[PDB]
Write a protein that binds this ligand. Structure first.
Ligand SMILES: Cc1cc2nc3c(=O)[nH]c(=O)nc-3n(C[C@H](O)[C@H](O)[C@H](O)COP(=O)(O)O)c2cc1C
Ligand SMILES: Cc1cc2nc3c(=O)[nH]c(=O)nc-3n(C[C@H](O)[C@H](O)[C@H](O)COP(=O)(O)O)c2cc1C
Ligand SMILES: Cc1cc2nc3c(=O)[nH]c(=O)nc-3n(C[C@H](O)[C@H](O)[C@H](O)COP(=O)(O)O)c2cc1C
Ligand SMILES: Cc1cc2nc3c(=O)[nH]c(=O)nc-3n(C[C@H](O)[C@H](O)[C@H](O)COP(=O)(O)O)c2cc1C
Ligand SMILES: O=C1C=CC(=O)C=C1
Ligand SMILES: O=C1C=CC(=O)C=C1
Ligand SMILES: O=C1C=CC(=O)C=C1
Ligand SMILES: O=C1C=CC(=O)C=C1
Lengths: 197, 197, 197, 197
């Protein structure tokens, strides 16, 4: 089964998450895992002057999403929605839509926020778009036991893994957060191989 | 695979849809299909006086949901949410939740409204609860060609089948609505068999 | 202006919150603030054997919601939705709906969850129902500065105040949580008096 | 009060709706009404080749949103979300957010879809972003009587006006759709005047 982790990250928090998802997915015997990022939409100079992080994952084309059995989408929040970059990219999947190219493919979503607010809404509102493509939607529920832990500030929801970046972007994904992310990749890769070999 | 069509209906619109869903699911050779209803929560005499429809379907218990590989939930809208009767029933699945009894099972949703408004929000707000149980969420996308017909008033969304009951409840599910409902039953059942045998 | 804080609470966390909302609302010159709870739907004996908390707020009728200028709804989550009790109560507002009794009234929502997951979805999915009644929806945004604080586990979202009850129900609303709740009551009471005197 | 009708349109459906909204808002004597569009993000030549409609409305800047008492946002759907063009624009309101520049301002949303699906989800997913800015969210409920008509295919929801463009974009907003749009403009404008003078 082929698994794409398709993400947008400006400052690396979703990048770090995407890597953990990919690691989880790679634990599954029979899973081919690929990590790509969606195109930047900001002018390059503005991206750099805002301190955007350069990334080594290659940029995806809309067209190549058809090659996968499971796509795990990562996006930071922009006010409770997916980022403009992820939105812009999904807006170019109209050809895939008309041909039913993503229909019945597995989809799962992970997110990042500055201070937590909007992390559920970002995921569930991404699910909407996935549903229009007829993708099978995979939440993670409460299998990841870190989800019960209210002793420390922690991303992660039954809807998909999340990370809390701090208001100033200074926080890094915590071990509990990355554990949920790895769980998500492995669970979805498992389902992918179950259905597609 | 075992497929439960679990529904709530007061005036029979969801009940009719539920039979169409069961009918589609039954086309799938590996699929054992059962139709049950959630308990009425209204006093029996207020229900009669309101003109409520009597229904032959057996009443489900919360516990028996664990016995199935896929549950397709039918509910009328109450102001853009599932009905209090469906909510009440799902609020009694806390034991199933704690044991992960519905985790990884397939879930799909269909709905009915008086005049169309809230039909999307009912389905996707229902998906939220399904996600807490770690259920795999199954939208229908646009495989059902009737979803492209805008020549007549008709329910059905990429999220799941719907019906339009009319302001006074006098409309009956149309051929196109029932056909989307059958498709949804077949699609979910085929996925249930693909996953579980 | 008259402000109703209308809540459901089984174990007191939303009750404690509702009291803080009411206190906030009472700081506003010209605001008449009333606190009532919706009816219990569980059999009384089961309510007691589950350790349900007895409450001194009187039970509201659906009919009396028409008397207010602003209604602040409090509910704990049941899997990312409002509780069955709140759902059941709102389902009896069909008379108010047909007469436009809540149309243009202010509405705001606060929630409680065991471990955080579903707290955004509970609020925004309650907003849906409020919208069908034509209520003006009041989120709190980021005016409450505790919302920037990622140093301690903390409820509260830009959508409305929330509290984290702990998996076992043992946590009590924190000062930061109650501060956001008080903010919400006062902000909404302010708007109520601005519009209605 | 100053009322901004801010929209994105590729094929003119939202543009037509936007003019109807402006028209309704202008009926309110205290209301100064301005119609602006968000920038196109497609290369100018891809836009022409796609058959995009040229539009006379001035292009808004993110900053000038601060100047208004009420903003009514129009966007076509992209798979159940606002369009990438609207998302991109709203992603540039981080300065306004940090200064609380839109806090307490009125917000209301209208949408357009090819065949109806995603019309609710587009509006309410847009409300999420509005809530992060602390905007007061203004749904239309069922004051517009056309919302009770199920005799013809027509957009319009309790969340805000919508139009149905057809699969090929050939439908024009109907009389009933435009009338819901006018109502929404009038209602929001009257609220803007009631709050701000
Ligand atoms: C336009 C804009 C809107 C944002 N909205 C939110 C928000 O609603 N809630 C929040 O917690 N953080 C918000 N943030 C913070 C981003 O989500 C955060 O910087 C991102 O998660 C970091 O992930 P990345 O490093 O992968 O880019 C916003 C940031 C920008 C630039
Ligand atoms: C409390 C209440 C709330 C309702 N809210 C809506 C609504 O928001 N939108 C709508 O189109 N119909 C609404 N209706 C209509 C019901 O959804 C409709 O009667 C139901 O779909 C009929 O399905 P059934 O025959 O299976 O019970 C409402 C009805 C009641 C009693
Ligand atoms: C049926 C049921 C479902 C629940 N679902 C969730 C949930 O999805 N997320 C969560 O964090 N807590 C969940 N809980 C916990 C309740 O939300 C928590 O006990 C409540 O917030 C306490 O508030 P109260 O004391 O006012 O009743 C659930 C509890 C029950 C009984
Ligand atoms: C990328 C893309 C995604 C779309 N997704 C949907 C959709 O989910 N549902 C729908 O009914 N129409 C969909 N459409 C149709 C547009 O919403 C429709 O063309 C638009 O409402 C026309 O409005 P406008 O003329 O103002 O641009 C989509 C179109 C594009 C280009
Ligand atoms: O190009 C497109 C037009 C309409 C739609 O729904 C999807 C793609
Ligand atoms: O009793 C219960 C309490 C909380 C929950 O999430 C499930 C069951
Ligand atoms: O009683 C009723 C209340 C609301 C509605 O939409 C339909 C019936
Ligand atoms: O620059 C920024 C503006 C707003 C926000 O929420 C995070 C970063």
């Amino acid at each position: 089964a082929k698994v794409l982790v398709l993400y947008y990250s400006m400052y690396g928090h979703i990048e770090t998450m995407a890597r953990a998802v990919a690691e989880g997915a790679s634990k599954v015997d029979g899973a081919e895992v690929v990590v790509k990022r969606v195109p930047e939409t900001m002018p390059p100079q503005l991206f750099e002057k805002a301190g955007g992080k350069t990334q080594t994952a290659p940029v995806a084309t809309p067209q190549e999403l058809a090659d996968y059995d499971a796509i795990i989408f990562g996006t930071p929040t922009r006010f409770g929605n997916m980022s403009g970059q992820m939105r812009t990219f999904l807006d170019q999947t109209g050809g895939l839509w008309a041909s039913g190219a993503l229909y019945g493919k597995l989809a799962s979503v992970f997110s990042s926020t500055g201070t937590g607010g909007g992390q559920e809404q970002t995921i569930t509102s991404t699910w909407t778009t996935l549903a229009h493509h007829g993708m099978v939607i995979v939440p993670i529920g409460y299998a990841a036991q870190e989800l019960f832990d209210v002793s420390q500030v922690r991303g992660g929801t039954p809807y998909g893994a999340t990370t809390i970046a701090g208001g100033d972007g200074s926080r890094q994904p915590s071990q509990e957060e990355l554990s949920i992310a790895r769980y998500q990749g492995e669970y979805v890769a498992g389902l992918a191989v179950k259905l597609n070999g």
